[PDB]
Design a protein around this nucleic acid. Structure first.
Lengths: 787, 787
DNA sequence: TTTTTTTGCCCGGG
DNA sequence: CTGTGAGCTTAGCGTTAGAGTAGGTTTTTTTGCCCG
């Protein structure tokens, strides 16, 4: 029977599914669950269209196996948003059963240690981290099920190949003893050409379907000609709205369906192009009630509440959104602050917004269905669009039940027509393993990390064991020089001190730099950079300011932003000698800054790669310093060029890097440097104690200045209006870390002015004056708060 | 009544007195207790000769006050040795009544906060510290008494002026409390002139006596004749055993009384001459028996134990004590290690040694009575002997029940004879406070400190309060320049940031540098060096090795040794680059050391008052680095020119500086420096753990290189003989902090070469060899253990 | 011409 | 590498910036102390 009640679920879960509004399974879900050995614990891989109840199968398999066996089930997800979504959803299903559901994702982590959980939801990197901890604890016996979503990610060399490493380690360490299935794996994937090879690699039952609740019409617009997937001409397009300077009539493609109250989604090659088209479409829709075609109903009093909520936010209401949002038009790209993204997505999900320009950010990691998807070009970023990304984009078409059909138009030039058709009539590439070397190529970083994670984990200490591991990879399954690739990795790992060549055959063991890389879950290519910095700090370290810790803690990135090397070069030359000293030690150099402004950005070498890495890391330190130096965000945007979305990506990554490089120092045994880093980690907590934000009402208090007046005397502004101006001066003067206003002998006055300046306040005032002004400000606040 | 039982003592203490001493008070003690107001709680000064029953009156006054008034006393003593002796004495005397006697002295401190104690036996430097902490905590009401010994010290510029400050602060705060006593001061002093002035300052009763249980027959020897103190000729000398070996015939003056079974104590100017002269005297007892008045009774049944009790010491039986001690002849000076002195204290107190040459270490701080004192010259060092020393050296002449009269003989040439007569017929100079400026002299550092302590404790806030305080000093009594001294100090503090100026006249407050100077109880004149070294080391701190953090905790002294600049230069040229960097980053300079080789003495200025005082502190850090490197002391003493008695005082002193400067860096707010110092503090500890001490001897293992074995679990030589060489190799390779062998880019070859040296044991071994030898040496020692 | 002795601070395990 | 729109704000016109995404340990509220 398709009715889910007939499957004998525990009634709490059945009632929750009924409350979630799903009561019957789809036929493909019954056929998948009835595969004979799957319910017996055989591994499974199934590919079905996204949304469409795809996860319902994996949820029922988890539910049974965690009830049939007390072992823990691990749910691995590609992104923190979908991880958090699935965590709270699974909690609402299972918590009434008494199942403990928590997860590892972002800076979120379980309230109590992994022993307490029954189901863990986590990101790929949190999953591969947890497995290394279960191996080191030798508590791998705890792991009873491992559910992998988006199993096609194995080919993504940047991240996602860790999904191959993770499953290879689970298979190897189990089959090392198993030679009734101990760790049932479930994969969820795409309609890959070689999906059955992945199923054979996992020794899994294979199921695949094409069923989707709302059928999807692919199409191309070529001039005015609209072609279906079979290239039958469905229409010659007529623009209902004539637009200045528009050759593609995207505004007519929007308006044609808006006439029936159906929302539109418009994928654009870039942030700028999203804002341009959200502006244009808003300016055309603004004309309608002046010039008028059927009427458009906007429920503008709801958009007033939406747009007010953007005004409430400390970001403020964006100057483009002022123009577009009143008319139900928005744009949505990663340069927005995360609360702005949630407001815009929420207003779309309620149907208040009706047209939404977006970059790829609504293709991956956000689920928002719309009746009509529009893709602005077949070329993205000066390259042809990836077929995987295209097929994710179009899958946004159609709300379940609300739409009878989902529509997608690829917009294309007649000059592009072949490149257009190639996306519809092409198909996904075969999945392949990033462990595979090209014949002429160095052994890949994915293999090097793969070998490191066993040796340093206390597993497979000999090359006989490593080959017995290596033959378990999907590289091996794909193949049925590779026999030499393991011995090339250990040659590389030895030459970079990650492992010890214990002898008398040979046996390999972790160095500290091994256990550090593993315990921090850094890439071996990152710890070559982080270590060569951290070792250079040990030679000579600046304690007097924060910059020389931020340089060690600041996240590694490649092109976190475009860097204007001239505004960096000038901003370096402006640095105080207090902090210009840090630049001297860190290795920022006039010769490289001058070449970065004057030349083309210089090519890499063994030396010049780290030289570049220092500068790119140092520039990111200044931005992170300005964030802790309490520069208002609106200034930093001008000062460096990084938008307010990138700044949150840096605030998130920097805090985590403090924890990682504390632990990296512990495993190295550098317990002095580790204690500096562990105490600095207390200061990268950017979260405002909003209880202090009362004192923040007076302009003269930074968060520390408020907290020290919150600490000393528990000043409310109502009490700061009552304070003795000299007592405020005393409480300020004795809150700061002491810096001598005297020159010391054999200093230079540059340094002495900076110690004085570091105690002046706004550089322009001294406490003997400012302590009066702040009491005057407090009574000027109080007399207004009373009215 | 002289019978102690009539005074109403608690019987436990009375019977303890019967056990320890005698049932009757001396005739003078019943006078001093019956100065009519003393028993009512009036302050008291008294003087009695050379500890002949001196302290019994003070101890009885403590017992009365602490039992009946029930407030907490503070007993202030000039040395830790005297303080240690008195602590056990006052414990064993009072503890049966439950008086919670403990004390603050050296590294020793009570197991609980002050509020638990009833008597705090205390050194001077730690009594001032404790008074400050009472003032800062506003606990000064807890103090019920202070009792003071050697109150004639107030005139010393180097120490003991603290005893003026301490009593001034007690008087000042008492008067501010009063403006039957809140505190009773009992002061014990030499028979000074102007002692009535000291008594008048404290508003105290006065007692003086010349009473002795054993009279002193002072004399001087000149030209083979003896003269009385009254310059009566006693006799022409009767030289026996007369020999050319030393024409002053010291050997005759010693042996002449040895015939009576009574001991000789022979003070000499210097260790080199003292130790030499005990060897000469031992050769004469050799010359007697090897040619045998009677030959000296050697009692070798005990000397052959005591002399082997020295062989058991980590430095063996001293290479000169080997020659002299078989005869009952010894020497005792502060160039011997502390245990050698404590043993020789026993061997003289039991009378097994009969001739003991000494420096002034037996003059003050330890009480070894002997029948005849001999003083080899009126000159000591480059100057005439201080009469306060002479009248203490000759004070050693009598032991209450063992002999009937004490003797002393100063030895003089026929020339310069009057230099001795001025010692015989002289008397002590009147004591004058070191606060006293000369009219043309820049105000003295002991005044500057006195002004600081009252500001930072906050009991004197204004210029009026500091003129009111100054009227409580002993300077004020001595002057009946004071008007210009107080303001000139408040200027000098301001111009060095110890204090701050505010309005509502001017009112003064401590900086953090004030509270750091006071809480470390450093001298203000020292804090200007210590802070300058910290400030220059918040820059450019070398975390790679301890030498920099040693330099910040190295004790600073005036000529802690004479420094051989050529040997220091030969060390500085030869340090590892990782340490030669630390030399540069504290200002050690090749051209300066070249100058100090070219000439030791120069005109100076505050730049040169740093330069010649940076290097002297760094040379002392080199010695501390060798101690914590576990270098053999036989090498150290050869390497630097230090000697083994100093080294043990440096070990104790450096363990103090690391704990003061942690409080210094705490109260400056330099918390990122505090948590480095507070971590290195734990490693300045040269003892051995409860269970390691037997293991660390064997297989040539350094303390932690042994401890890392025991850190795996309890292990013994029998276990180290069983362990697999490869298991120990991994255990050793897991012990060290990581130090990469790779050369970094932008690094010198010499800078990595040290990291590949720092890994080696010592003949330099890697663990592949040493982890075998450690087991082979263990099993071969086990083959000597089992037999 | 080389050359005497002395002293400071904090808190642990439970 | 390959590619294009709208790019700057000069004045009406030329030619350039450009997607989104992830890691770590430790893990809650309060005065006073006593013993090796």
């Amino acid at each position: 029977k398709l009715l889910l009640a007939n499957w004998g679920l525990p009634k709490a879960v059945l009632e929750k599914y009924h409350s979630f509004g799903v009561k019957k399974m789809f036929e493909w879900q019954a056929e998948c669950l009835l595969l004979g050995q799957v319910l017996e614990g055989k591994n499974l891989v199934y590919s079905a269209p996204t949304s469409a109840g795809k996860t319902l199968v994996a949820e029922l398999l988890i539910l049974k196996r965690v009830l049939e066996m007390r072992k823990k089930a691990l749910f691995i997800l590609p992104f923190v948003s979908v991880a958090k979504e699935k965590k709270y959803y699974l909690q609402s299903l299972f918590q009434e059963v008494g199942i403990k559901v928590d997860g590892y994702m972002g800076s979120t982590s379980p309230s109590r240690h992994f022993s307490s959980l029954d189901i863990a939801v986590c990101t790929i990197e949190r999953a591969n981290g947890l497995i290394n901890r279960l191996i080191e604890e030798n508590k791998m016996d705890l792991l009873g099920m491992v559910v992998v979503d988006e199993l096609h990610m194995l080919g993504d060399s940047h991240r996602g190949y860790l999904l191959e490493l993770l499953l290879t380690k689970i298979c190897y360490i189990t089959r090392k003893s198993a030679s009734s299935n101990a760790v049932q794996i479930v994969g969820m994937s795409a309609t890959l050409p070689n999906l059955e090879l992945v199923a054979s690699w996992l020794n899994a039952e294979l199921y695949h379907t094409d069923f989707r609740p709302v059928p999807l019409l692919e199409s191309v617009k070529v001039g005015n000609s609209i072609y279906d997937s079979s290239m039958k001409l469905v229409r010659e397009f007529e623009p209902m709205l004539q637009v200045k300077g528009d050759e593609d009539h995207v505004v007519s493609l929007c308006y044609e369906t808006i006439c029936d109250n159906h929302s539109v989604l418009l994928f654009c090659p870039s942030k700028k192009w999203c804002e341009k088209l959200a502006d244009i479409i808003a300016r055309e829709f603004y004309n309608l009630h002046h010039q008028a075609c059927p009427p458009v109903i906007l429920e503008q009093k709801e958009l007033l509440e939406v747009m007010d909520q953007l005004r409430r936010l400390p970001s403020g209401l964006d100057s483009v959104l002022q123009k577009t949002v009143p008319w139900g038009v928005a744009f949505h790209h990663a340069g927005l602050t995360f609360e702005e993204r949630d407001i815009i997505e929420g207003a779309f999900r309620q149907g208040l917004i009706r047209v939404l320009a977006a970059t790829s950010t609504l293709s991956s990691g956000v689920n928002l269905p719309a009746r009509r998807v529009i893709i602005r070009t077949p070329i993205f970023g000066g390259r042809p669009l990836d077929i995987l990304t295209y097929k994710q984009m179009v899958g946004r078409a159609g709300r379940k039940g609300v739409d009878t059909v989902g529509e997608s138009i690829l917009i294309c030039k007649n000059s592009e027509k072949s490149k257009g058709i190639a996306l519809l009539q092409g198909s996904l590439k075969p999945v392949r393993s990033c462990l595979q070397r090209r014949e002429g190529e160095e052994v890949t970083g994915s293999m090097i990390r793969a070998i490191l994670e066993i040796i340093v984990g206390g597993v497979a200490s000999t090359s006989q064991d490593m080959h017995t591991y290596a033959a378990c990879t999907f590289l091996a399954a794909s193949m049925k020089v590779q026999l030499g690739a393991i011995e090339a990795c250990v040659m590389w790992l030895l030459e970079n001190e990650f492992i010890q060549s214990t002898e008398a055959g040979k046996v390999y063991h972790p160095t500290h730099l091994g256990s550090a890389t593993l315990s921090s879950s850094l890439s071996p290519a990152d710890t070559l950079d982080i270590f060569a910095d951290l070792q250079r700090a040990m030679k000579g370290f600046v304690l007097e300011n924060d910059l020389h810790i931020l340089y060690l803690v600041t996240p590694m990135f490649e092109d976190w932003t475009t860097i204007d090397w001239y505004r960096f070069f000038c901003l370096w030359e402006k640095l105080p000698t207090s902090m210009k000293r840090v630049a001297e030690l860190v290795g920022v150099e006039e010769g490289f800054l001058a070449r970065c402004v004057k030349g083309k950005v210089v090519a890499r070498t063994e030396r010049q790669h780290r030289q570049m890495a220092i500068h790119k890391r140092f520039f990111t330190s200044l931005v992170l310093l300005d964030l802790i130096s309490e520069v208002p965000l609106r200034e930093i945007n001008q000062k460096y060029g990084c938008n307010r979305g990138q700044i949150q990506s840096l605030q998130q990554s920097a805090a985590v890097y403090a924890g990682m490089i504390t632990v990296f120092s512990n495993r190295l045994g550098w317990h002095n440097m580790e204690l500096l880093l562990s105490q600095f980690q207390k200061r990268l907590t950017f979260g405002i104690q909003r209880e202090l934000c009362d004192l923040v009402r007076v302009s003269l208090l930074n968060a520390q200045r408020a907290r020290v007046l919150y600490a000393s005397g528990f000043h409310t502004v109502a009490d700061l209006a009552r304070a003795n101006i000299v007592e405020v001066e005393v409480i300020l003067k004795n809150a700061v870390p002491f810096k001598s206003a005297r020159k010391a002998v054999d200093e230079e006055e540059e340094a002495v002015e900076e110690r004085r300046n570091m105690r002046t306040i706004w550089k322009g005032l001294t406490e003997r004056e400012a302590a009066a002004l702040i009491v005057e400000e407090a009574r000027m606040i109080l007399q207004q708060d009373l009215v």
